[PDB]
Amino acid sequence: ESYHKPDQQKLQALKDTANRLRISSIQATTAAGSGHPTSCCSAAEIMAVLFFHTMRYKSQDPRNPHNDRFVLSKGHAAPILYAVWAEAGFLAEAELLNLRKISSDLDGHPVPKQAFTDVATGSLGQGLGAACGMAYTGKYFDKASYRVYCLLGDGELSEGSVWEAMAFASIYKLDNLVAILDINRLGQSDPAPLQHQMDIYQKRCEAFGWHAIIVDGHSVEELCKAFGQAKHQPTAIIAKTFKGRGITGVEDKESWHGKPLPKNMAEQIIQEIYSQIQSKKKILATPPQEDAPSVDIANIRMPSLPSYKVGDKIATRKAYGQALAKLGHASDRIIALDGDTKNSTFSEIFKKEHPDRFIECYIAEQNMVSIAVGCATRNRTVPFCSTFAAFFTRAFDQIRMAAISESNINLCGSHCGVSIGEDGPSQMALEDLAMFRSVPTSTVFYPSDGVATEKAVELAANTKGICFIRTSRPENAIIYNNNEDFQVGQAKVVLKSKDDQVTVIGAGVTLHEALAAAELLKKEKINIRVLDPFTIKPLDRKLILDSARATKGRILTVEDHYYEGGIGEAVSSAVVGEPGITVTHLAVNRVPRSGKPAELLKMFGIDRDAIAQAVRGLIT
Amino acid sequence: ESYHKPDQQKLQALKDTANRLRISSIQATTAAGSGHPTSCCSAAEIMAVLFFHTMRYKSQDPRNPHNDRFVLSKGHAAPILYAVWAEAGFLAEAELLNLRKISSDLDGHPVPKQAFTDVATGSLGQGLGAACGMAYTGKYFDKASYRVYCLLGDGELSEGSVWEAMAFASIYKLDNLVAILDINRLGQSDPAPLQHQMDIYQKRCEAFGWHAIIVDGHSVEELCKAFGQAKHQPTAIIAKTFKGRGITGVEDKESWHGKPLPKNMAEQIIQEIYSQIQSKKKILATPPQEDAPSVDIANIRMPSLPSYKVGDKIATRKAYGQALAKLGHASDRIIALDGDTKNSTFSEIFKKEHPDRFIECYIAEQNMVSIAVGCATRNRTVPFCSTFAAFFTRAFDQIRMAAISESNINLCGSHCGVSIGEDGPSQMALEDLAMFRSVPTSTVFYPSDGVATEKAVELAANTKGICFIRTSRPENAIIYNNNEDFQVGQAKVVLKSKDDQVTVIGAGVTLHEALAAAELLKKEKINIRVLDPFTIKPLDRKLILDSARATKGRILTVEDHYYEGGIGEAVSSAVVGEPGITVTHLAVNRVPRSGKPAELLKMFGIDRDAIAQAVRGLIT
Ligand SMILES: Cc1ncc(Cc2c([C@H](O)CO)sc(CCOP(=O)(O)OP(=O)(O)O)c2C)c(N)n1
Ligand SMILES: Cc1ncc(Cc2c([C@H](O)CO)sc(CCOP(=O)(O)OP(=O)(O)O)c2C)c(N)n1
Ligand SMILES: [Ca+2]
Ligand SMILES: [Ca+2]
Ligand code: NA
Ligand code: NA
């Protein structure tokens, strides 16, 4: 469609709209007693032009799949986001004054309980990554006409994650993506490093492969024109603005970030801004081209049961790749992402079978998680991202925000624990159980064999929230029948007798070490019950306690993870106070080192001999 | 100090050295059966020229404070780092063959148990930030002549944290820092995005303010010359190389990352490389200018006791800023770092009193932690970095690697929990105790008032490892006398009696809500013991159990944190199986929302009324 070059009356209406947005931002933050009106005011023309000239969307159906997407990366400007959606007619105007109240959903930073918000923002530097996932989806998966617009602050651009997204967008030719940089010179507590050196912002964007246009960010005409031209590259509109634009005495001043105007001042300033507004008549939003395809919502099932064989040896990292590739034959919704580790995580198998649905994210875990979050918005895809579990610590804030965003993403982290051997601790995940258990919408799968891994992949695909699958490097035996039934929150007793002395809880390599310990102990006429949790979160407290009650109330938990936040603390928290129950915990007590896998399990006290000694100790 | 322009015999010796380094990297990785010889071989001329032409260091004293610093950011090239230290005469040549053995300290990636290693690397993209800390220290604190050199991979440059470091270096004019980029075209599992588009690497480095020089990375002469000119800017040596350089048939080939040569192949290739070496005579290292100052190692003590009075009200975040500024008057080694949040964390108090020792890191938490790690190397400074606790999740991998680096850094995270109120969950730390408790060298301080905060700052300054101080936004009353003695691992019973029915454990805001609950329960003739842990890690289990035994074995924990990995799980894990002890937990069960602080404590079940109700329920 052709650009509609606005006339002076449309330009004036956009100016009027921007000033209404300023007034509302001040009124709401003054009513709340907190917030960021100066951060809203530098963006007012940008917001007016995007919502009332450039973008195409259904004002009464913000989540419509055909709509252009807007991502407010500088989330603290939430009051102006609320104001535009009131201006567009979706949000009642009076509700704007209930900003930050416990009786309102117009919270401090945007959240998806708001229909007009796809991803929660408020941790700076993450919105552009989500926007890149939306734009990739639009161009390559939905193959639709919608565009994606993301507004960033200039302080925000100090976050490395933004530059990961900038590079992603140029690698993948996201010519449907626009980043608007609100270059208002000041951060929270000092000027932003580059201040108003517009040329350096242009050079950085261009060096990263973007088409970069410097504009007066308070000129509705310049904004209409810059947004009005599509490009063959991702486009950066580098807008020179002033913080607190339009607030006399505050515009371009320090010491005003996150400071509301006191009532008396707000009244004077609003009268001043209102005096500039020529008409009360509001501009109407313009709707989109309806060319986004239908998407299936049904549960996704593996095309057949697992085809392993009991006794065969396979590492759960390889079983994950096999299983993910298999699931991709069952549904076109499954997509896979990996950070230059596909040959190690075995996500390469999925890339070989379904290349159109694999996204190489390179060595940039923060962005990879944000891409996945963006791809999962509006349920357009079911993403599985993978790397070594250790490197998901690099993306903890993106995972944290993903839960705040009520996102449904799946993450598979390999190479857990000391059992990887010789690479040493930089590559060993020893805190990932602690990390993912602390994510409030998480489900944590720790499959112990190839069958359980395939079942975990299938279950995760159909489970809402942040699903984590912990895979392993050692080649352990298949212990489960292919037709064993698996469920979230259901553990398995893999070894039992009537005279069991202790219930030993292990997972991945430590389950197999526990089974080996059981054989050692049998020689000593000592039987142990062995339990595989399957999911660490939620934990099968009932089976754990029923097992303990059959083994003199004694539990021993053994894990290839640090002591804090892992399996043993999960078990202790579940059963503390239960009459006659005792818990012994074996875990890794300090930063490891290099050696062979079996050597390290011995050094760190979680191998078959350490388990057997613990058991012999306990019976006394 | 003048450049020594090498003669052809020196150049030939540098080539011979590079080829010896190649041979050793192959021998060691073939002996180990794992490792990254192709990643070593692209860097061999770079390593030869740095260690045997450019750098100034004491070969028998790698930690000497006057030495130039070298950071191997692409840590998986460890075997060539080990080779250069053998070439320099510090390491025995035979030990190189023990790479990755449990009997050796020549681990898979570099670690500070090696005298020649300052910071552990292995998680890509972090070395440059550590190097920036070293360089900032050298120019501004030590005010010494040493230079800092950091070798990066090209896939590694996809990490946003690298760009944060690049921007830091140019803001702070680190004209004593050199980044060497090993542009060998290939990542782990595919070509790096830019491959050999050298001009784009130059453009990106220049846009970020570096002097950028493109060289042939296999030309010892071009490397000598590029390293031999000092600049007024941080300098990037953009070296065009080939992965596996010198390994016939493997050079510039995919499918060889992290793959050792089989024995038969190693023997053939080593014979060919050896045929290229003209002399067995080794180059000697050259010592440095000894102008680094003496630094004092003594215990650091506050110049006076805290000057708070019982009953006064102060937020622990403000007490932190006051305490930090006070300690800075006590010791010259204290430095403060903050990520554009100084007005919120109150690190601005330190900046005002000791501006030369404050480092503004901008909105870039991952780099901030790496800067601190670098500043703490060789014990040159005692850093305290601060931001909101939620945003330390952005730096979890840097914190993880800091522990692998045996680093002594101090972290203060403010704005914990729902008690911050209206900003909402993006700003709320609810997983920070889980996170830091999983860091194996950590000490976790959770001060409940101003006095405890000042004592925590003092103790942290003198405590090794990763110290975390969790501060709070509500103003709560001072409950401790100024002369109260505090120690790591020692809790305090702040309310007790002979007829206590429950031991309630709270911290920060929830300690105060517990005291309020006790006044409430007094109406009901019900007495409760209240315990302040002070440190969450390590926990005073003795005092907690002694308390529980005086209160019918009953413990209730209440915390402004998620359930997993926090205070309640620490306590449960500590007492599980103790006869007669029960533990009940109150925490935050899901992603919160905006409201007034008191309304959120109420909504999420961790206020005085929730505590009292829980107590009543235990008594029945
Ligand atoms: C990763 C991360 N680190 C720190 C913060 C705290 C913070 C903010 C809170 O959302 C509201 O004050 S706003 C803010 C300053 C943002 O400055 P800019 O990006 O220049 O935006 P603005 O000038 O348009 O407000 C910080 C440092 C953050 N939100 N995220
Ligand atoms: C944050 C982070 N993400 C992923 C990895 C795994 C990894 C490595 C292991 O240390 C050794 O294989 S090396 C590696 C490839 C590095 O490629 P480059 O930076 O181009 O270096 P190189 O070509 O010089 O080897 C990856 C993806 C990593 N170490 N760190
Ligand atoms: Ca700004
Ligand atoms: Ca490379
Ligand atoms: Na899922
Ligand atoms: Na310390």
Describe this structure in words.
Chains A, B: It is an enzyme of class 2 (transferase). Chains A, B: Catalyzes the transfer of a two-carbon ketol group from a ketose donor to an aldose acceptor, via a covalent intermediate with the cofactor thiamine pyrophosphate. Chains A, B: The modification N6-acetyllysine is found at residues 5, 10, 143, 203, 231, 240, 259, 537, 602. Two copies of one chain form a homodimer. Chain A has helices spanning 8-32, 37-41, 44-54, 78-87, 127-141, 160-171, 198-207, 220-228, 263-274, 316-330, 342-345, 348-353, 365-376, 396-404, 432-437, 450-461, 509-522, 541-550, 567-575, 597-603, 608-618, and strands spanning 69-72, 148-153, 177-183, 211-216, 235-240, 313-314, 334-338, 358-360, 382-388, 409-414, 442-445, 466-470, 476-477, 492-495, 500-505, 527-532, 535-537, 554-562, 582-588. Chain A has 620 residues and is of the alpha/beta class. Chain A folds into three domains: 1-294, Rossmann fold (3-Layer(aba) Sandwich); 295-488, Thiamin diphosphate (ThDP)-binding fold, Pyr/PP domains (Rossmann fold, 3-Layer(aba) Sandwich), CATH 3.40.50.970; 489-620, Rossmann fold, CATH 3.40.50.920. Chain A has a seven-stranded mixed sheet with strand order 8-7-9-10-12-11-17, sandwiched between helices. In chain A, strand 11 (442-445), helix 16 and strand 12 (466-470) form a beta-alpha-beta unit. In chain A, helix 1 (8-32) packs across helix 4 and helix 17 (509-522) packs across helix 21 (608-618). The interface between A and B is large, with 109 and 110 residues. The structure holds the ligand Cc1ncc(Cc2c([C@H](O)CO)sc(CCOP(=O)(O)OP(=O)(O)O)c2C)c(N)n1 (2 copies), calcium ion (2 copies) and sodium ion (2 copies).
